[PDB]
Amino acid sequence: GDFLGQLITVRGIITRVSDVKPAVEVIAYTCDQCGYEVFQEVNSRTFTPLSECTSEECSQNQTKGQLFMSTRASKFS
Amino acid sequence: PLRDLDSEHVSKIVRLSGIIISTSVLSSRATYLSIMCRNCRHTTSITINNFNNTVSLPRSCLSTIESESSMANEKNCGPDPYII
Amino acid sequence: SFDRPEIYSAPVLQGESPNDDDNTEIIKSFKNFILEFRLDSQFIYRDQ
Amino acid sequence: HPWKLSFKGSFGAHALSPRTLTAQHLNKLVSVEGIVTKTSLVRPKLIRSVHYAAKTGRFHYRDYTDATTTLTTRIPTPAIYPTEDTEGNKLTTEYGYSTFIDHQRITVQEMPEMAPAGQLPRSIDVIL
């Protein structure tokens, strides 16, 4: 446990291979009122959806928007 | 004139003119400041604009409200921990 | 151990904007004042 | 660098069975023998975090301790894992130069040859 962060070379036997499924990295969010796109980067295991808007133009105003995510604009892996 | 200032003139743009008696000795308010949680070691910063009672220091160490796993996994700064 | 997540955005679609004369609307009006007032042979507050 | 020791040596004082060890001779040094069973997994432990700030271009320094190593009851001072330290530069994390030390905990059953005929065995734990 002192070789952390190094670049290594190991060998062995591939055992219990899982299946390939997409990993979500960043999520797009359509404003529908201010017309911006909010982006949230997740590096944790789980996460949460976020609040109604975080624009600069929906900000400093009485009526903020209410958002929802989108699929085709997100980046997967 | 200063004689007639009704309650209908509350919080409205009213001008006047008179005679100034005497000033005071100058004190100081604060606008920008960096704080520290005396247990959690948690630092933020606070700006204010309309300083004219209005705001004070909060009463939670605020490191608990965090969108990161490993920091929220690692207690009580409580009570009001903030020292300027 | 990771670092903090971040939030950023940018407005792209100029939609859902009635002239309701409000929070963001009033702010843009005074940019039309200071740079874009000019009295007779002189503009003053921009030169102030 | 710790430069630890052994304390090798035979003594008839506290070479007792772990079966009869509990509630007596606490906070003392005891020599126990027995059976190694159900060995857990080897994990490393985080000690010293390293952080790079982008704009100032310097590193920093931060340690973390636990009550296991020190052997004396010291005032616990937990510290949250740092983010956004002084002005608002992002504390970009690094690795490699951050130091780490391995860790393990195991359980020890007593000797079956020393055990009585049939009763329920009882055990304790040892962290390495």
CSV table of C-alpha atoms in Angstrom, one decimal:
chain,number,residue,atom,x,y,z
A,1,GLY,CA,0.0,0.0,0.0
A,2,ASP,CA,2.8,2.5,-0.8
A,3,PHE,CA,2.5,2.2,-4.6
A,4,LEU,CA,-0.6,4.4,-4.8
A,5,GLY,CA,-0.6,6.9,-7.7
A,6,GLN,CA,2.3,5.1,-9.5
A,7,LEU,CA,2.0,3.5,-12.9
A,8,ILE,CA,2.3,-0.3,-12.6
A,9,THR,CA,2.3,-3.6,-14.5
A,10,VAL,CA,0.4,-6.7,-13.2
A,11,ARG,CA,-0.7,-10.0,-14.6
A,12,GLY,CA,-3.2,-12.7,-13.7
A,13,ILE,CA,-6.4,-14.4,-14.8
A,14,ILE,CA,-9.6,-12.6,-15.9
A,15,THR,CA,-12.3,-13.8,-13.7
A,16,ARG,CA,-16.0,-12.9,-13.4
A,17,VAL,CA,-16.2,-10.3,-16.1
A,18,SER,CA,-19.3,-8.0,-15.8
A,19,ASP,CA,-21.4,-6.4,-18.5
A,20,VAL,CA,-20.8,-3.2,-20.4
A,21,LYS,CA,-23.4,-0.5,-19.5
A,22,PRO,CA,-23.1,3.3,-19.9
A,23,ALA,CA,-21.8,5.5,-17.1
A,24,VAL,CA,-23.2,8.9,-16.9
A,25,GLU,CA,-20.6,11.7,-16.4
A,26,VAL,CA,-22.3,15.1,-16.9
A,27,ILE,CA,-26.0,15.9,-17.1
A,28,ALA,CA,-27.5,18.7,-19.2
A,29,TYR,CA,-30.4,20.8,-17.8
A,30,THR,CA,-32.7,22.9,-20.0
A,31,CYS,CA,-34.0,26.1,-18.4
A,32,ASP,CA,-37.1,26.6,-20.5
A,33,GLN,CA,-37.4,30.2,-19.2
A,34,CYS,CA,-34.0,31.8,-19.3
A,35,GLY,CA,-32.9,29.5,-22.1
A,36,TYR,CA,-29.5,28.5,-20.7
A,37,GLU,CA,-28.1,25.0,-20.1
A,38,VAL,CA,-27.0,24.0,-16.7
A,39,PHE,CA,-24.2,21.4,-16.3
A,40,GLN,CA,-23.5,19.2,-13.3
A,41,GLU,CA,-20.4,17.0,-13.1
A,42,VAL,CA,-20.7,13.9,-10.9
A,43,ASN,CA,-17.6,12.0,-9.6
A,44,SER,CA,-19.4,10.2,-6.7
A,45,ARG,CA,-21.2,6.9,-6.7
A,46,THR,CA,-24.6,8.5,-6.4
A,47,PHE,CA,-25.9,12.0,-6.7
A,48,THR,CA,-29.0,14.1,-6.8
A,49,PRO,CA,-31.0,16.2,-9.2
A,50,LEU,CA,-30.7,19.9,-8.5
A,51,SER,CA,-32.9,22.9,-7.9
A,52,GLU,CA,-35.3,24.8,-10.0
A,53,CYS,CA,-32.7,26.9,-11.9
A,54,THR,CA,-29.2,28.2,-11.4
A,55,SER,CA,-28.9,30.8,-14.2
A,56,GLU,CA,-27.5,34.3,-13.9
A,57,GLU,CA,-30.6,35.7,-15.6
A,58,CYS,CA,-33.2,33.7,-13.8
A,59,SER,CA,-31.3,35.0,-10.7
A,60,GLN,CA,-31.9,38.5,-9.4
A,61,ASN,CA,-35.5,38.1,-10.5
A,62,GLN,CA,-38.8,37.2,-8.8
A,63,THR,CA,-39.9,34.3,-10.9
A,64,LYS,CA,-37.3,31.6,-11.3
A,65,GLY,CA,-37.8,28.8,-13.7
A,66,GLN,CA,-38.2,25.0,-13.2
A,67,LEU,CA,-35.9,22.7,-15.1
A,68,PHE,CA,-35.6,19.1,-16.2
A,69,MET,CA,-32.7,17.1,-17.6
A,70,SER,CA,-32.1,15.8,-21.1
A,71,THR,CA,-30.7,12.6,-22.6
A,72,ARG,CA,-29.2,13.4,-26.0
A,73,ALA,CA,-27.1,16.3,-24.8
A,74,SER,CA,-25.4,14.5,-21.9
A,75,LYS,CA,-22.0,12.8,-22.1
A,76,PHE,CA,-21.7,9.1,-21.2
A,77,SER,CA,-18.9,6.6,-21.1
B,1,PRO,CA,-41.2,71.4,5.8
B,2,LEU,CA,-40.3,69.2,8.8
B,3,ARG,CA,-43.5,69.9,10.6
B,4,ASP,CA,-45.7,67.6,8.5
B,5,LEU,CA,-44.3,64.1,8.0
B,6,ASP,CA,-47.3,61.8,8.1
B,7,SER,CA,-47.4,58.0,8.1
B,8,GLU,CA,-48.3,58.2,4.4
B,9,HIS,CA,-44.7,59.4,3.9
B,10,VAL,CA,-43.2,56.2,5.4
B,11,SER,CA,-40.5,54.7,3.2
B,12,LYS,CA,-40.9,57.2,0.3
B,13,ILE,CA,-38.6,59.6,-1.4
B,14,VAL,CA,-39.1,62.7,0.7
B,15,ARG,CA,-36.7,65.7,0.7
B,16,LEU,CA,-36.4,68.5,3.2
B,17,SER,CA,-34.0,71.2,4.5
B,18,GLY,CA,-33.0,72.3,8.0
B,19,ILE,CA,-30.1,73.0,10.4
B,20,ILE,CA,-27.5,70.4,11.4
B,21,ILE,CA,-26.9,70.3,15.1
B,22,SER,CA,-23.8,68.2,15.7
B,23,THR,CA,-22.1,65.1,14.3
B,24,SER,CA,-21.0,61.9,16.1
B,25,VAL,CA,-17.8,59.9,16.4
B,26,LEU,CA,-17.1,57.6,13.4
B,27,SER,CA,-17.6,53.9,14.0
B,28,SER,CA,-17.1,51.1,11.4
B,29,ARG,CA,-19.3,48.4,9.9
B,30,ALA,CA,-17.9,45.4,7.9
B,31,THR,CA,-18.6,44.2,4.4
B,32,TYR,CA,-16.3,41.4,3.4
B,33,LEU,CA,-14.9,38.9,5.9
B,34,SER,CA,-13.5,35.3,6.1
B,35,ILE,CA,-14.7,33.1,8.9
B,36,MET,CA,-13.7,29.7,10.4
B,37,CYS,CA,-15.5,26.8,12.1
B,38,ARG,CA,-13.8,26.3,15.5
B,39,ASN,CA,-14.3,22.6,15.3
B,40,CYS,CA,-14.9,21.6,11.7
B,41,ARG,CA,-12.2,23.9,10.2
B,42,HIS,CA,-14.7,25.2,7.6
B,43,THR,CA,-14.2,28.6,5.9
B,44,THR,CA,-16.5,30.7,3.7
B,45,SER,CA,-16.8,34.4,3.0
B,46,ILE,CA,-19.7,36.9,3.3
B,47,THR,CA,-20.3,40.0,1.3
B,48,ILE,CA,-23.0,42.5,2.0
B,49,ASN,CA,-24.3,45.6,0.1
B,50,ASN,CA,-27.4,47.1,1.9
B,51,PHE,CA,-25.8,47.3,5.4
B,52,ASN,CA,-28.4,49.8,6.5
B,53,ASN,CA,-29.7,44.1,12.4
B,54,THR,CA,-29.8,43.1,8.8
B,55,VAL,CA,-27.5,40.1,8.8
B,56,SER,CA,-25.5,38.1,11.4
B,57,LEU,CA,-23.4,35.0,11.6
B,58,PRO,CA,-25.2,31.7,11.1
B,59,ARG,CA,-25.5,28.9,13.7
B,60,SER,CA,-24.4,25.7,11.9
B,61,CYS,CA,-20.9,24.6,10.9
B,62,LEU,CA,-22.3,24.2,7.3
B,63,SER,CA,-19.8,21.5,6.3
B,64,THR,CA,-22.7,19.1,6.7
B,65,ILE,CA,-24.4,20.6,3.7
B,66,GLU,CA,-21.9,19.3,1.1
B,67,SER,CA,-22.4,17.6,-2.3
B,68,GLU,CA,-19.3,15.5,-1.8
B,69,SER,CA,-19.3,12.0,-0.3
B,70,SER,CA,-15.9,11.7,1.4
B,71,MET,CA,-16.1,15.1,3.1
B,72,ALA,CA,-19.7,14.6,4.3
B,73,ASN,CA,-18.7,11.1,5.5
B,74,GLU,CA,-16.2,12.6,8.0
B,75,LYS,CA,-19.3,15.5,15.2
B,76,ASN,CA,-20.6,19.0,16.0
B,77,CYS,CA,-19.2,22.5,15.5
B,78,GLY,CA,-22.4,23.5,17.4
B,79,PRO,CA,-23.2,26.0,19.0
B,80,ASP,CA,-22.5,29.1,16.8
B,81,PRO,CA,-18.9,28.5,16.0
B,82,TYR,CA,-18.0,31.4,13.8
B,83,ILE,CA,-15.1,33.6,14.7
B,84,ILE,CA,-14.2,36.4,12.3
C,1,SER,CA,-11.5,11.0,-2.2
C,2,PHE,CA,-12.7,13.5,-4.8
C,3,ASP,CA,-13.1,17.2,-4.9
C,4,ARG,CA,-16.3,19.3,-5.0
C,5,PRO,CA,-18.7,19.2,-7.9
C,6,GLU,CA,-19.3,22.3,-9.9
C,7,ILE,CA,-22.2,24.0,-11.6
C,8,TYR,CA,-22.0,26.2,-14.7
C,9,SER,CA,-24.3,27.0,-17.6
C,10,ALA,CA,-24.9,29.4,-20.5
C,11,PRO,CA,-28.2,30.7,-22.0
C,12,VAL,CA,-28.5,29.6,-25.7
C,13,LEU,CA,-32.2,29.6,-26.7
C,14,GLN,CA,-33.8,33.1,-26.5
C,15,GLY,CA,-37.3,31.9,-25.6
C,16,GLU,CA,-40.0,32.6,-23.1
C,17,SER,CA,-39.3,36.3,-22.7
C,18,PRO,CA,-42.3,38.6,-22.4
C,19,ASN,CA,-41.6,42.3,-21.8
C,20,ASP,CA,-42.9,42.2,-18.2
C,21,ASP,CA,-40.7,45.2,-17.2
C,22,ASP,CA,-39.1,43.5,-14.2
C,23,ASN,CA,-35.9,42.4,-12.5
C,24,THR,CA,-33.5,41.9,-15.4
C,25,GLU,CA,-35.5,44.2,-17.7
C,26,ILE,CA,-35.0,47.4,-15.7
C,27,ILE,CA,-31.2,46.8,-15.3
C,28,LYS,CA,-30.7,46.9,-19.1
C,29,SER,CA,-32.5,50.2,-19.4
C,30,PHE,CA,-29.8,52.2,-17.6
C,31,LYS,CA,-27.1,50.9,-19.8
C,32,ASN,CA,-29.1,52.7,-22.4
C,33,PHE,CA,-28.9,55.8,-20.2
C,34,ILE,CA,-25.3,56.4,-19.0
C,35,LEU,CA,-23.5,55.5,-22.2
C,36,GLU,CA,-26.4,56.6,-24.4
C,37,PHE,CA,-27.7,59.9,-23.1
C,38,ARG,CA,-26.4,63.0,-24.9
C,39,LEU,CA,-27.8,66.5,-24.3
C,40,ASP,CA,-27.2,69.5,-26.6
C,41,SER,CA,-23.6,69.2,-28.0
C,42,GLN,CA,-22.6,67.2,-24.9
C,43,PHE,CA,-22.9,63.9,-23.2
C,44,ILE,CA,-22.1,64.3,-19.5
C,45,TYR,CA,-22.4,61.2,-17.3
C,46,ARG,CA,-20.3,59.1,-19.6
C,47,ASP,CA,-17.7,61.9,-19.5
C,48,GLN,CA,-18.3,62.3,-15.8
D,1,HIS,CA,10.2,7.3,11.5
D,2,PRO,CA,8.8,5.3,14.5
D,3,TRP,CA,11.7,2.9,15.4
D,4,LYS,CA,9.5,0.5,17.3
D,5,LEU,CA,10.4,-2.4,19.6
D,6,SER,CA,9.5,-6.0,20.4
D,7,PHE,CA,9.4,-6.7,24.1
D,8,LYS,CA,10.4,-10.3,23.7
D,9,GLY,CA,10.6,-12.2,27.0
D,10,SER,CA,8.9,-15.0,29.0
D,11,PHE,CA,7.1,-14.0,32.2
D,12,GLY,CA,4.7,-16.0,34.4
D,13,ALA,CA,2.8,-12.9,35.3
D,14,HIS,CA,0.3,-12.4,32.4
D,15,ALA,CA,0.6,-15.4,30.1
D,16,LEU,CA,-3.0,-16.4,30.8
D,17,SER,CA,-5.6,-17.8,28.5
D,18,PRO,CA,-7.8,-15.4,26.5
D,19,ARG,CA,-10.7,-17.4,27.7
D,20,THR,CA,-10.2,-16.0,31.2
D,21,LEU,CA,-8.8,-12.6,30.3
D,22,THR,CA,-11.8,-10.2,30.3
D,23,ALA,CA,-12.5,-7.6,33.0
D,24,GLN,CA,-9.2,-8.1,34.7
D,25,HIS,CA,-5.7,-6.7,34.0
D,26,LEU,CA,-7.1,-4.0,31.7
D,27,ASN,CA,-4.7,-1.3,30.5
D,28,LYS,CA,-1.8,-3.8,30.9
D,29,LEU,CA,0.5,-5.7,28.7
D,30,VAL,CA,-0.6,-9.3,28.1
D,31,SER,CA,0.9,-12.2,26.1
D,32,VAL,CA,-1.8,-14.3,24.4
D,33,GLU,CA,-1.4,-17.3,22.2
D,34,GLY,CA,-4.1,-19.2,20.2
D,35,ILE,CA,-5.6,-19.9,16.8
D,36,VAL,CA,-5.6,-17.5,13.8
D,37,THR,CA,-9.0,-17.6,12.2
D,38,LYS,CA,-11.1,-15.6,9.7
D,39,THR,CA,-8.4,-13.2,8.5
D,40,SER,CA,-9.9,-9.9,7.1
D,41,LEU,CA,-8.8,-8.0,4.0
D,42,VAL,CA,-5.7,-5.7,3.7
D,43,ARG,CA,-6.6,-2.1,3.5
D,44,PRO,CA,-4.3,1.0,3.4
D,45,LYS,CA,-5.0,4.0,5.6
D,46,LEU,CA,-5.0,7.7,4.6
D,47,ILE,CA,-2.7,10.0,6.6
D,48,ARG,CA,-1.5,13.0,4.8
D,49,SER,CA,-3.4,14.8,2.1
D,50,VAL,CA,-1.8,16.8,-0.7
D,51,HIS,CA,-3.6,19.6,-2.5
D,52,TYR,CA,-2.7,21.8,-5.4
D,53,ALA,CA,-4.2,25.2,-5.9
D,54,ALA,CA,-4.3,26.3,-9.5
D,55,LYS,CA,-3.8,30.1,-9.7
D,56,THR,CA,-1.4,30.5,-6.8
D,57,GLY,CA,0.5,27.5,-8.1
D,58,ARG,CA,1.6,26.1,-4.7
D,59,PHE,CA,1.0,23.0,-2.7
D,60,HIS,CA,-0.3,22.6,0.9
D,61,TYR,CA,-0.1,20.4,3.9
D,62,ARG,CA,-2.8,18.5,5.9
D,63,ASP,CA,-2.6,15.5,8.3
D,64,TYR,CA,-5.2,13.3,9.9
D,65,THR,CA,-4.9,11.1,13.1
D,66,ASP,CA,-6.9,8.5,14.9
D,67,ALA,CA,-7.0,7.3,18.5
D,68,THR,CA,-5.6,3.8,17.7
D,69,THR,CA,-1.9,4.7,17.2
D,70,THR,CA,-1.2,7.3,19.9
D,71,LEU,CA,-1.9,5.0,23.0
D,72,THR,CA,-2.8,8.1,25.1
D,73,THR,CA,-6.3,9.6,25.3
D,74,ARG,CA,-5.7,12.9,23.6
D,75,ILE,CA,-8.4,15.5,22.8
D,76,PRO,CA,-10.0,14.5,19.4
D,77,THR,CA,-9.9,17.2,16.8
D,78,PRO,CA,-11.6,16.1,13.6
D,79,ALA,CA,-11.0,18.0,10.4
D,80,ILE,CA,-13.1,18.0,7.3
D,81,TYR,CA,-11.4,17.1,4.0
D,82,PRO,CA,-10.4,20.5,2.5
D,83,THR,CA,-12.1,22.4,-0.3
D,84,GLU,CA,-11.9,26.1,-1.2
D,85,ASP,CA,-9.3,27.1,1.4
D,86,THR,CA,-8.4,30.8,1.5
D,87,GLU,CA,-9.8,33.0,-1.3
D,88,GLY,CA,-11.6,30.7,-3.6
D,89,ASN,CA,-9.1,28.9,-5.7
D,90,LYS,CA,-10.0,25.3,-6.4
D,91,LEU,CA,-8.1,22.8,-4.2
D,92,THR,CA,-7.2,20.3,-6.9
D,93,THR,CA,-6.3,17.0,-5.3
D,94,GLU,CA,-3.1,15.1,-6.0
D,95,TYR,CA,-1.8,11.7,-5.1
D,96,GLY,CA,1.5,9.8,-4.9
D,97,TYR,CA,3.2,12.2,-2.6
D,98,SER,CA,0.2,11.7,-0.3
D,99,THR,CA,1.4,9.1,2.2
D,100,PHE,CA,-0.3,5.9,3.1
D,101,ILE,CA,0.1,3.0,5.6
D,102,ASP,CA,-1.5,-0.4,5.5
D,103,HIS,CA,-3.9,-1.7,8.1
D,104,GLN,CA,-5.4,-5.0,9.2
D,105,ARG,CA,-7.6,-6.5,11.9
D,106,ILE,CA,-7.9,-10.2,12.9
D,107,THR,CA,-9.6,-12.4,15.5
D,108,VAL,CA,-7.8,-15.0,17.6
D,109,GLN,CA,-9.5,-18.1,19.0
D,110,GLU,CA,-7.9,-19.9,21.9
D,111,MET,CA,-6.0,-23.1,21.8
D,112,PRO,CA,-8.1,-26.3,21.3
D,113,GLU,CA,-5.5,-28.4,23.1
D,114,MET,CA,-5.8,-26.0,26.1
D,115,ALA,CA,-9.6,-25.9,25.8
D,116,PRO,CA,-11.9,-27.9,27.9
D,117,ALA,CA,-13.9,-30.9,26.6
D,118,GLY,CA,-16.8,-29.1,25.0
D,119,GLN,CA,-18.0,-25.5,25.6
D,120,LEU,CA,-18.5,-22.4,23.5
D,121,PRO,CA,-15.2,-20.7,22.6
D,122,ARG,CA,-14.9,-17.0,23.1
D,123,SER,CA,-12.4,-14.7,21.4
D,124,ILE,CA,-11.1,-11.2,21.1
D,125,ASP,CA,-9.6,-9.1,18.3
D,126,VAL,CA,-6.2,-7.7,17.3
D,127,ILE,CA,-5.4,-4.8,14.9
D,128,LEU,CA,-2.0,-4.9,13.3
